[PDB]
Amino acid sequence: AGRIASFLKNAWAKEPVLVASFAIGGLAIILPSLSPYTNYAIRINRATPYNYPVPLRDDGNMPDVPSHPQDPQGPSLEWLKNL
Amino acid sequence: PFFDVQKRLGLDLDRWMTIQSAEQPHKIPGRCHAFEKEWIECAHGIGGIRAEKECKIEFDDFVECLLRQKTMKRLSAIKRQRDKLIKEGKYTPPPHHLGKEDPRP
Amino acid sequence: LFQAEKDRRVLQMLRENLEEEAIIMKDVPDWKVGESVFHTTRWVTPMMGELYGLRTNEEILSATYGFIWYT
Amino acid sequence: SRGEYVVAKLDDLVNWARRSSLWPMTFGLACCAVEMMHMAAPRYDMDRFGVVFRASPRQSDVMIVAGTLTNKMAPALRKVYDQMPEPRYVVSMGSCANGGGYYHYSYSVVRGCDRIVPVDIYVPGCPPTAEALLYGILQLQRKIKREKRLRIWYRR
Amino acid sequence: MPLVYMNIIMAFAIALAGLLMYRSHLMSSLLCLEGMMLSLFIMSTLIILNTHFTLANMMPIILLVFAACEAALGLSLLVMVSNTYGTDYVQNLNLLQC
Amino acid sequence: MWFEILPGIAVMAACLFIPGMATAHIHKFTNGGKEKRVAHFSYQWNLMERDRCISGVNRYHVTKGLENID
Amino acid sequence: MNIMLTLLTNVTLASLLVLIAFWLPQLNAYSEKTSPYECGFDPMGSARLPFSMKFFLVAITFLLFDLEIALLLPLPWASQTNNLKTMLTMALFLLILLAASLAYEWTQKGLEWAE
Amino acid sequence: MFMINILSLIIPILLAVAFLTLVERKVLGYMQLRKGPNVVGPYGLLQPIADALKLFTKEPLRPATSSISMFIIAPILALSLALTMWVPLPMPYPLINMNLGVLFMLAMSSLAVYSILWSGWASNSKYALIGALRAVAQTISYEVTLAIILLSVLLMNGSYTLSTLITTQEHIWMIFTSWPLAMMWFISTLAETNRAPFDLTEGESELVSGFNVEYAAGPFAMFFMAEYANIIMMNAFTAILFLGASHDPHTPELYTINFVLKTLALTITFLWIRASYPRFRYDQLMHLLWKSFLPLTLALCMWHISLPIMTASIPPQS
Amino acid sequence: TMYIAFILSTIFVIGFVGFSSKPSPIYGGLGLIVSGGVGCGIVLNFGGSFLGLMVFLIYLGGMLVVFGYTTAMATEMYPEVWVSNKTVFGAFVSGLMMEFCMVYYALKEEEVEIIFKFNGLGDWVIYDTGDSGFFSEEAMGIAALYSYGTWLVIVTGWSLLIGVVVIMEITRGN
Numbered sequence A: 001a002g003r004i005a006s007f008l009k010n011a012w013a014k015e016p017v018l019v020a021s022f023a024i025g026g027l028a029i030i031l032p033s034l035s036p037y038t039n040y041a042i043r044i045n046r047a048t049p050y051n052y053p054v055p056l057r058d059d060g061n062m063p064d065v066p067s068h069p070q071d072p073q074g075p076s077l078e079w080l081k082n083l
Numbered sequence B: 001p002f003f004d005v006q007k008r009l010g011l012d013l014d015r016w017m018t019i020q021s022a023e024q025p026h027k028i029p030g031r032c033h034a035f036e037k038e039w040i041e042c043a044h045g046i047g048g049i050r051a052e053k054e055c056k057i058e059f060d061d062f063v064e065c066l067l068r069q070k071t072m073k074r075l076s077a078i079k080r081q082r083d084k085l086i087k088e089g090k091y092t093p094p095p096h097h098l099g100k101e102d103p104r105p
Numbered sequence C: 001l002f003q004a005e006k007d008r009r010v011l012q013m014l015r016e017n018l019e020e021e022a023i024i025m026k027d028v029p030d031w032k033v034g035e036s037v038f039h040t041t042r043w044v045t046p047m048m049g050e051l052y053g054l055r056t057n058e059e060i061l062s063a064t065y066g067f068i069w070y071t
Numbered sequence D: 001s002r003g004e005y006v007v008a009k010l011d012d013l014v015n016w017a018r019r020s021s022l023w024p025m026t027f028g029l030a031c032c033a034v035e036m037m038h039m040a041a042p043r044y045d046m047d048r049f050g051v052v053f054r055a056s057p058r059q060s061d062v063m064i065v066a067g068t069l070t071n072k073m074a075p076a077l078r079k080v081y082d083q084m085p086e087p088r089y090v091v092s093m094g095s096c097a098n099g100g101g102y103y104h105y106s107y108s109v110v111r112g113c114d115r116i117v118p119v120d121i122y123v124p125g126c127p128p129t130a131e132a133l134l135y136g137i138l139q140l141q142r143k144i145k146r147e148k149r150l151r152i153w154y155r156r
Numbered sequence E: 001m002p003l004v005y006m007n008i009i010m011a012f013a014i015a016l017a018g019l020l021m022y023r024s025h026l027m028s029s030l031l032c033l034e035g036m037m038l039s040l041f042i043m044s045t046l047i048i049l050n051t052h053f054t055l056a057n058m059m060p061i062i063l064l065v066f067a068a069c070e071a072a073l074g075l076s077l078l079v080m081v082s083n084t085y086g087t088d089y090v091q092n093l094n095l096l097q098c
Numbered sequence F: 001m002w003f004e005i006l007p008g009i010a011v012m013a014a015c016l017f018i019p020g021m022a023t024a025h026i027h028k029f030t031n032g033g034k035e036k037r038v039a040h041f042s043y044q045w046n047l048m049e050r051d052r053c054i055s056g057v058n059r060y061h062v063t064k065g066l067e068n069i070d
Numbered sequence G: 001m002n003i004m005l006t007l008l009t010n011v012t013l014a015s016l017l018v019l020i021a022f023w024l025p026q027l028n029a030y031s032e033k034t035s036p037y038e039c040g041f042d043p044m045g046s047a048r049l050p051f052s053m054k055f056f057l058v059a060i061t062f063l064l065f066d067l068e069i070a071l072l073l074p075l076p077w078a079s080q081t082n083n084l085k086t087m088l089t090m091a092l093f094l095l096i097l098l099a100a101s102l103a104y105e106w107t108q109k110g111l112e113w114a115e
Numbered sequence H: 001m002f003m004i005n006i007l008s009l010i011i012p013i014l015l016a017v018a019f020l021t022l023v024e025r026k027v028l029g030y031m032q033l034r035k036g037p038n039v040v041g042p043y044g045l046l047q048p049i050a051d052a053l054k055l056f057t058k059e060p061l062r063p064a065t066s067s068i069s070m071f072i073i074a075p076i077l078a079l080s081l082a083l084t085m086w087v088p089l090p091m092p093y094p095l096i097n098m099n100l101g102v103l104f105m106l107a108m109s110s111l112a113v114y115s116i117l118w119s120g121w122a123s124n125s126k127y128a129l130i131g132a133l134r135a136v137a138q139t140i141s142y143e144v145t146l147a148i149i150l151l152s153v154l155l156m157n158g159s160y161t162l163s164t165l166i167t168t169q170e171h172i173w174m175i176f177t178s179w180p181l182a183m184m185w186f187i188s189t190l191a192e193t194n195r196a197p198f199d200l201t202e203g204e205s206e207l208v209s210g211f212n213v214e215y216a217a218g219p220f221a222m223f224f225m226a227e228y229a230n231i232i233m234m235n236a237f238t239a240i241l242f243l244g245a246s247h248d249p250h251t252p253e254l255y256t257i258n259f260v261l262k263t264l265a266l267t268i269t270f271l272w273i274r275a276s277y278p279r280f281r282y283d284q285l286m287h288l289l290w291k292s293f294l295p296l297t298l299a300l301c302m303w304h305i306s307l308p309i310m311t312a313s314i315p316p317q318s
Numbered sequence I: 001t002m003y004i005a006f007i008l009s010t011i012f013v014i015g016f017v018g019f020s021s022k023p024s025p026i027y028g029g030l031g032l033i034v035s036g037g038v039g040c041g042i043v044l045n046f047g048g049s050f051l052g053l054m055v056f057l058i059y060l061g062g063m064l065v066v067f068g069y070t071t072a073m074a075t076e077m078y079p080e081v082w083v084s085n086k087t088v089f090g091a092f093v094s095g096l097m098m099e100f101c102m103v104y105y106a107l108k109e110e111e112v113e114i115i116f117k118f119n120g121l122g123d124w125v126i127y128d129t130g131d132s133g134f135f136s137e138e139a140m141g142i143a144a145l146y147s148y149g150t151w152l153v154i155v156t157g158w159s160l161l162i163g164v165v166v167i168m169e170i171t172r173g174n
Ligand SMILES: COC1=C(OC)C(=O)C(C/C=C(\C)CC/C=C(/C)CC/C=C(\C)CC/C=C(\C)CC/C=C(\C)CC/C=C(\C)CC/C=C(\C)CC/C=C(\C)CC/C=C(\C)CCC=C(C)C)=C(C)C1=O
Pocket: D025, D026, D027, D028, D032, D033, D034, D036, D037, D040, D052, D053, D054, D055, H011, H014, H015, H017, H018, H021, H024, H025, H028, H048, H049, H051, H052, H055, H204, H221, H224, H225
């Protein structure tokens, strides 16, 4: 650890720009895999309706597909409302 | 010559981009999606020789959708005939084609 | 609503283009009015000249370049 | 006359611009150049009057010949004067530029820059004070104010 | 085909004829080589935008990337030739014979 | 003194005010006192064209409503 | 249409300014006035002779890095996709390869001008 | 009415350029303990008018060795692009509203590079050629760094529309969000506009006026106008991009006043820097960007790619 | 119609005629910049704003390096312009005449070249009636370079890095 400490001390005294550059790059690589909000960002991108929601022809055996938009069935954005 | 590593390993390196009827972002349809789908479905599993002999009608429709040659031929013929007719005063365009109407909403 | 309006407008423009084509191409020896250039009978979307073919240059320009040139 | 009035007003407008925008060339030869720096200095700021140094002769209206003109230097002075586009003016500053100065009877000194270039103003002194050079610049401005090129042309 | 494609293909042919007919400089040949890829870019994007081949819109960018890779290669070879001979003339590249 | 610089900066600011205010006034003038419609997409352009068609005067900014449907 | 009109207006105004500049004032040209400028003395050589370029390698690296920035520019739209992890991995891969190119050139002394 | 709007965008820009010349004279004078122009008019307000009349009534000459065609085209291109860069700026309403308004400005700047190159090469003089090559090197360095910095900052925004920039900066400022990129962007705009300490193409100390050494009378005035228009346009772009102003749709004059004040502040900062610092060497400028800004620029680009994803703060596409 | 696309295509061909007649690299670069800008205009009319701006920016950056190189490596005492040389003027005039002949023939009749068949009608005719909504199809397709096209990104990045290594190795000398 002493060698690493000496190297970092010398680099911070000679190339602080490079030290900061590598630190920021390393944080950029590592942090997204640990943040719990990456899945939230994915879900927010999914929740955006760019195209028309084409309806399904009811076969009488689709209990999880709402008959009307305001019916309790279907995806919920209540999590996004309070975020 | 052709080593089908993609088919052997189950990978997908450029087959997503080979044709315009495949999965497009935001499900954006191609200009000739229906014609290309029909031609591909006709020609699937019969090889090149039979595909060229037997799916010729589907391929001709696909090429017509792509390039629009017969359509432009018809349009040019109609334009030339209309210009000749109005040159000698034998044709009078209607007001809805002359810009004196209210179009549909 | 806009889907229904678009379909009705497209069909009306096609119908009036067909009427004008019947009026014009009446002395042409071999010419069938409304003949398709596709072997299939499936509905095929008009390109740009099937709709705005026999219309004014202002309408043609608006339909073909109005969005791109709107700044 | 209407034409005479118009030309008088127009050439008053043109002379005002040239008088109020003077751009001396960055060209100093000897000790007289230090007084040009002191005229540029905060005490006698020449930038107040619209007098601004430009390095290139193509972008200069006034050539302030400030210092001794030697035989080895006279061709360069004439070359830069020729490269200055018209209208152009010359202010010879100090004794060396005016006549010979301390070096009048010398084998290597041109006795006056007026042998080489047409001089409009002569500023005496060795060196002239910054106030003296500023008075010379103002006298040049008043000389420009009297020019009547359009008035001559109308009667031409 | 419209006349626009005809013009683009004609421009490509003109650029190809320019490259195959050297005059003195190697740099002019490199400029002709860069023009060919510009015409290819324009033609490919015109074709792709017209048929709404959405996933093919990334192809012209890869075309540009390898275009400028070739331009970099040509510039490097040109500087080496200039260092050797003093000029970028194609006449000096005559040591090897067929 | 340093406040002799202010008239020049004031004139420069007065010159820089003109473009933006002029553009805003012209946008409101040519659009019936409302903002110029922003059509960044085909949907917005189609909306503008529909507004032109339904207006009956070939101007998209002439808005019609309930009094026009009935 | 609007952008074409704007470009035409700008070009026409600039051309009118040039035309006024070259025709309004009195002209008096001779050989000495129009000779090239070299601080008062005649130039020894010609300005068309080759001018050595001590940063020739940095220019080519600039071409390649210009390609890299062209690749990176569509990132704002790529961040709206559902494959956020793949998008992030590819963007970081491109940036790391650009950094690796810079580091290789820097350590191999490609950024040092020729002496 | 569109021609009227074009005129309202053009003529005030030229007037602001002339009075920026006057303002720079006076600010440099007062920082150098002088007064600056105060004799020509009331507080020297007629000095730019006198300068313009003098320049355009002076004789312009074409050098004997020059290529006349590219000698004339270069000032025309410079002034045309300087005036053109203003058309997509929202104050608060752009004259021409572009979906990709930033890449347009990048492309037009890269084209504005060639005016000085062609003027220097056409002049057929050694000082002009040296200035042109200095321009080549400077544009290399600042161009790559500018591209990446703009990419990251707009990545915090969501798109390439300046109106969307206003909407983004409704609440706080991009300077508060991303100040390191703001510092590097300010330096890059100095380099791009050829202002001190990076005024190397027209460096009077080493070269006699640099690339426009042979230009006189009107064609010189056009280069000066183009440079000052670029200065003001870059400062306005910086103010829009990093110092966001509140926008009221019913009374847009407030946004115009705030935008103008911030633009003037940044332009005065440019003049202040010119009065305060020495001049770089062009090799030192090239080594400054590639060896200092480019590593930090890449690291901050990675950081600003990752930050919206890891914080679930991805901006809307439209 | 307004024939804007056809006029811009003609200007594209004229710029190619210029830099292919090859007066000298300065004027070749000038013609190539003009052609790039006009091609940007063409693809802007066809729909691709990002692609037009990108090709324009890339060629503006590339021609900057070419100017620095032709100032250093590829310059002569009297650089050649189109009217300066008989060969250059002959090639330029031949290209212009061929382009004008093709344009005239296409306008007067449906010109079928020895290679391809071209129909003289509307570039507006060939366009599509359909529309997208609240997104740009071109922008989405280009942005799909990262989600889709992971292989293309890999090969492109490897090529760029190897290009840096190569240009460093070629110019090594010694
Ligand atoms: C030779 O040894 C030496 C000396 O000597 C012995 C010396 O002394 C010194 C001492 C000198 C110094 C220390 C400094 C000298 C060196 C320098 C390089 C000079 C330094 C000076 C500065 C840094 C600041 C001074 C300012 C300068 C240099 C800028 C120059 C100014 C211009 C070029 C201005 C010209 C441009 C203009 C006017 C803009 C163009 C005009 C317009 C755009 C206006 C047009 C408007 C319209 C068209 C609109 C009209 C329409 C309207 C109004 C409405 C109409 C509407 C309708 C509807 C019709 C030294 C060092 C020395 O070594």
